[PDB]
Structure formats: C-alpha cells, structure tokens
C-alpha cells in the first residue's frame with residue numbers, strides 16, 4: 001500500500017548499515033579462509049533446496065554467519081556447526097515452521113550432536129544479541145521489483161539468481177551493502193534480459209545513480225561471466241529449474257555498455 | 259535473575275507464564291516472561307526469536323517496551339515494562355456500562371499510532387486482539403505479545419494451518435491468499451473498535467466458514483465490483499449465499515457519523531482499499547481525542 005513503502009525502504013537502509021559485517025575479517029580468522037566460507041554457503045543453498053526453505057531464510061543465515069564470524073574465531077572444525085545454528089535460527093525467524101533440530105543435525109551427516117547445535121544457536125543469539133531482523137539483498141530486490149514496467153519474471157529470477165550468487169564470495173562482496181548488490185543485480189539482470197537499464201525511479205528512490213553502481217557491477221558481471229566455472233555450483237543447479245525459468249541457462253552477455 | 263523477586267503469576271500466552279515481579283535493586287515493577295527452555299528438544303522457540311528481535315527495534319509509547327533478556331543455560335527471561343490489565347479483561351469487567359466513548363476513541367487512536375509505527379518498520383503483528391492489548395492506569399494502551407509478528411522486508415506467506423484466531427481475521431485470509439499485508443492488522447483493529455463499542459465481538463464465528471459468513475451477514479457478501487479479485491480467490495465459491503450490506507448504524511448504534519465512517523473504512527473488504535494506520539490517524543473522527551483514564 002505505497003503508504004509505508006517509503007518509510008520502510010528508508011528503514012531498511014539505515015538498519016542495513018548497522019547490521020553489517022566487518023569487511024576485513026576473513027583475514028583475522030587464523031584457521032579459516034574465504035574458500036571454506038564458499039563451501040559452507042553453497043552447502044546451505046543446497047540444504048535450503050532440500051527442506052524447501054525460502055530464499056530469504058538463506059540470506060538471513062549467511063548474514064548471521066558473517067556477523068558471527070565477524071567477532072568469533074572458529075576452527076575449520078567448528079564452522080559448519082556455525083552454519084547450521086545460523087541456518088536454524090534463520091528458518092526459525094523466517095519460515096512458517098522450520099525444520100526440527102534433528103533434521104538440521106541429520107543434514108550434517110550426524111557430525112555434531114543435537115545438543116551442540118542447541119548450545120550453538122544460543123551462542124549465536126548471544127553474539128548477535130538477538131539482532132536477527134537483518135536486511136537482505138532479497139529484501140532489497142523485492143522492494144526494487146516494485147518498479148518494473150512492465151514486470152517480467154525472467155528478470156526477477158535472473159536478479160535473485162545474481163543475488164544468491166554473491167552470497168558466495170566474501171572475497172569481493174562483503175565490501176558491498178546489501179542494497180547496492182541489489183541494484184547491481186537488478187540492473188545486471190534487467191540489461192541482461194531486456195537490454196533496458198536501472199530505472200530513474202530507482203535512482204530517485206535510492207539515490208543510486210547508475211554510475212555509483214559501477215564498481216559493484218563490474219565484480220558481479222565477472223562473477224556471472226565465470227559462474228559456470230565457479231568452484232561452487234549449488235546455486236546454478238538451483239536456478240536451473242523451471243520454477244525460475246532456467247534463467248541461469250540463458251547466457252551472460254559479454255559486455256556491459258558502461 | 260538474582261535481583262528479581264517474583265510476586266505473582268499474571269497470565270500465560272505462548273511458550274511462557276508471565277509474572278508480576280519487582281527488581282530488588284531499583285524497586286521497579288516488571289513483567290517477566292519465563293520460557294520453557296528444553297535444551298534437548300527444540301532450542302529457543304520461534305515465537306521468542308520473533309518477539310525479541312522485533313520488539314528490540316520498536317521503541318515507542320504504544321508498543322510495550324522490552325527491558326532486558328536474561329539468557330541463562332536452561333532459562334530465558336523476558337523483562338517487560340509492566341501494565342496492569344488487558345483490554346479483554348477491561349471490557350468484560352466493564353460491559354453492562356460499556357467503555358466510555360472518549361476512552362474508546364483514545365484507545366483506537368493510540369493503537370493506530372502503535373500499529374502505524376509497526377508497519378512503517380516493516381513489521382506485522384498478525385495477532386491483534388483484546389487479550390494482546392495491555393492498558394495501564396494512566397489511560398495508555400500498548401500493542402503487546404509479538405510472538406506471532408513477522409518482518410515483512412519480504413512478503414509474508416500465509417499458514418495454511420493458521421494457528422491465528424478467528425474473530426479478528428481479515429476476509430482476504432479466510433479466502434486464502436498466500437500473503438498477509440499491513441491490512442490484516444487494521445482489519446483486526448477495526449473489529450476490536452467495534453467490540454469496545456458494542457460490548458460484543460463483532461464477528462464471533464465458530465469456524466473458518468461460520469466466520470466468513472458472519473462477516474458476510476454484516477458487511478454483506480462481496481462481488482467483483484466491490485472487491486476486484488474475490489471470485490478468483492482459492493477459498494471463494496460461487497456457492498456463497500447472497501447477503502446484502504447492512505446499515506452500519508445498525509451494528510454500531512452508539513457510534514456517531516464520524517466513527518462509522520472510520521469503521522467502514524477499516525473493515526473494507528479489498529485489502530487494497532482498506533485504510534492504513536498512518537491514514538486513519540488523520541481521520542476526522544480523531545479530532546477531539548483526549549486521554550481519559552479507565553475505572554480500573
């Protein structure tokens with residue numbers, strides 16, 4: 001009911017700054033690396049695919065993971081545990097009702113005891129001080145999507161996909177606010193499907209000129225260009241399905257007009 | 259929890275009993291929610307995971323303030339500010355006379371500002387009902403109980419198995435869209451207002467279908483003129499009996515013209531036309547709002 005959209009939109013924005021992780025942090029983890037994180041996330045995408053979880057639940061979980069990583073050192077040994085806990089919370093916050101813990105435990109090939117997953121959820125909560133309502137790219141796209149003329153669901157799919165894609169690599173994408181990536185995504189996806197571009201609407205709503213978008217664009221386009229060689233694939237295989245119009249099948253376009 | 263003295267139980271809701279209790283160090287009175295923390299079955303419940311993160315962002319006079327969370331190993335404690343009654347109780351304790359006009363248009367006003375805040379923070383309450391509205395002896399009244407609230411950063415998909423309540427539930431849900439909107443909060447408030455007016459639940463159904471039909475008996479059954487969409491809603495049936503929209507002043511005699519205009523916008527069938535909290539606050543009916551205290 002466009003009576004709130006604005007207020008909200010603006011709140012997202014202000015939030016999205018507070019609830020952000022530490023750019024430079026993979027660097028202080030003495031025992032984990034970007035790569036390992038990519039592992040973990042692809043892995044979540046999947047787990048999400050299996051329990052038919054919404055995409056937001058995923059976005060949330062990573063958020064959690066990053067922030068959480070963002071003040072806790074954690075051994076290669078612990079991290080998937082950290083994942084699960086996040087995955088569990090996230091669902092809890094997000095989904096109409098979650099999977100039961102047990103499932104959560106089982107999807108790690110009984111590697112952690114249901115107790116430790118519990119002792120974890122609680123630690124996470126403790127570290128993110130129950131601050132669970134985090135802004136996601138998804139949240140952003142969704143508002144964004146309101147301003148399509150017309151709408152067109154290839155785009156939508158394409159964007160989400162893009163979106164998810166970036167979940168994967170702290171790498172570059174930690175450097176970028178959820179709302180930007182959003183942008184990047186939407187417009188990458190727009191261009192890609194329609195050859196149209198980031199609508200003045202949205203520049204007006206967001207104050208993001210297309211220019212401002214440009215650095216996060218470059219990265220994202222590359223990611224998309226390589227997507228198919230990426231070391232992790234769960235996300236593609238996911239946007240392969242009809243429910244998404246195999247968007248991910250369909251060809252990146254080779255240059256951006258920039 | 260060292261510094262709380264439990265003083266007496268004052269309710270359950272949802273994974274927890276509520277105590278009246280007092281902080282032995284400041285003397286402040288508070289309401290403690292104690293949560294069943296089974297650290298072997300389920301971990302922290304999804305309600306408590308909502309209520310807390312949500313309330314923790316909403317800070318405001320007609321939202322119940324959440325003071326502090328004591329997170330032990332086996333126990334989770336939510337410390338709320340403290341309010342003496344609930345509107346349900348009030349209205350019960352007060353039907354026969356009825357809640358004073360003035361008090362009512364005060365309450366509704368405040369609930370609107372509470373809700374109005376909720377929505378503009380992308381936050382949906384879903385569980386509006388006099389039991390979940392607390393009043394104090396200064397004539398305040400505060401949205402409370404956020405175990406059902408959801409953030410709507412993205413649209414909020416319906417439960418087919420709504421554990422949600424009758425009585426105050428938008429027709430659009432009863433015909434089963436796959437999303438909630440702001441509107442449903444309003445619809446509830448709508449009905450509460452009514453009830454507050456007339457000392458009886460406006461729409462006391464006994465089943466999903468009785469409930470539809472009570473509404474239809476009052477609002478009259480809807481068409482496509484009135485609610486473009488209807489005929490194609492999953493739970494919709496050309497089976498439905500035609501009732502005929504009734505004069506509001508039949509339903510809410512005591513209400514003056516301004517009141518009724520407000521009500522009938524509140525209860526609009528089309529989620530997309532039903533007035534918002536923001537906008538209601540600007541309605542004429544609010545013009546001479548004040549701030550009477552209850553007879554508590």
Ligand SMILES: O=[N+]([O-])c1cccc(/N=C2/N=CCC(c3cccc(Cn4cncn4)c3)=N2)c1
Nearest residue numbers: 269270271289338339340341342343389390403
């Ligand atoms: O019915 N109550 O919960 C109730 C009755 C009378 C007085 C009450 N006082 C307080 N004071 C502070 C907080 C508070 C409260 C906060 C959150 C949840 C609840 C429990 N609840 C309220 N409606 C349904 N469940 C109570 N109640 C509560």
